[PDB]
From Swiss-Prot:
Name this polypeptide is given: DNA-directed RNA polymerase II subunit RPB2
Full-sequence range covered: 50 to 196 of 1174
Location in or out of the cell: Nucleus
Domain of life: Eukaryota
Protein family: Belongs to the RNA polymerase beta chain family.
Name of the gene this protein is made from: POLR2B
Oligomer status and interactors: Component of the RNA polymerase II (Pol II) core complex consisting of 12 subunits: a ten-subunit catalytic core composed of POLR2A/RPB1, POLR2B/RPB2, POLR2C/RPB3, POLR2I/RPB9, POLR2J/RPB11, POLR2E/RPABC1, POLR2F/RPABC2, POLR2H/RPABC3, POLR2K/RPABC4 and POLR2L/RPABC5 and a mobile stalk composed of two subunits POLR2D/RPB4 and POLR2G/RPB7, protruding from the core and functioning primarily in transcription initiation. Part of Pol II(G) complex, in which Pol II core associates with an additional subunit POLR2M; unlike conventional Pol II, Pol II(G) functions as a transcriptional repressor.
Organism: Homo sapiens
DNA sequence: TGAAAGTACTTGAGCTTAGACA
RNA sequence: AAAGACCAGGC
DNA sequence: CTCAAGTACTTACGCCTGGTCATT
């Protein structure tokens, strides 16, 4: 879903056509970062899953896309403006997936994070509670 | 992705005739 | 906290 | 005007425990 489906969905959306000047919006490519928490002061910092549970936070990662804005002014010169890393929302991250902060960590690393090495993961942390999607 | 059934409504159809006596 | 929904579970 | 043949309502166990969530 993260690697393929999101990119396919954003690229398959029809471009925004507006109109007289014309405006075109195109979404180039998605970007996922590690799950980070934006505090009251706005300073980002990685969110560990245990901190998400205890503080009733949402273990999610921000989503950034590249947006190119094209204006047609009828003067034969269309000005295209590209925006990098445009934040459009946060996607909850399944625990121990590829994009989770627990990915690839050894038993000692997980213990240092107060996470059970035997915990299989595969569930989302929404508002502190642990949610599992059923097929 | 796959009730089931009973009841209260409508709506259409649609059918030889002749006058005298009777 | 109030009733609403949803979910899981016991017999 | 008046008979059979189509379209609408109306309902499907008994409790009991709890946890979560959005509105208020």
């Amino acid at each position: 879903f993260i690697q393929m489906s999101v990119q396919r969905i954003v690229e398959d959306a029809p471009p925004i056509d507006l109109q007289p000047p014309r405006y075109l919006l195109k979404f180039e490519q998605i970007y996922l970062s590690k799950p980070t928490h934006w505090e009251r002061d706005g300073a980002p910092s990685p969110m560990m899953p245990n901190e998400a549970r205890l503080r009733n936070l949402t273990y999610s990662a921000p989503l950034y896309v590249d947006i190119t804005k094209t204006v047609i002014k009828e003067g034969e010169e269309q000005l295209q403006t590209q925006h990098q890393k445009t934040f459009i929302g946060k996607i909850p991250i399944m625990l121990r997936s590829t994009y989770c902060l627990l990915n690839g960590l050894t038993d000692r690393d997980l213990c240092e994070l107060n996470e059970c090495p035997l915990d299989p993961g595969g569930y989302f942390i929404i508002n502190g509670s642990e949610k599992v999607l059923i097929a």
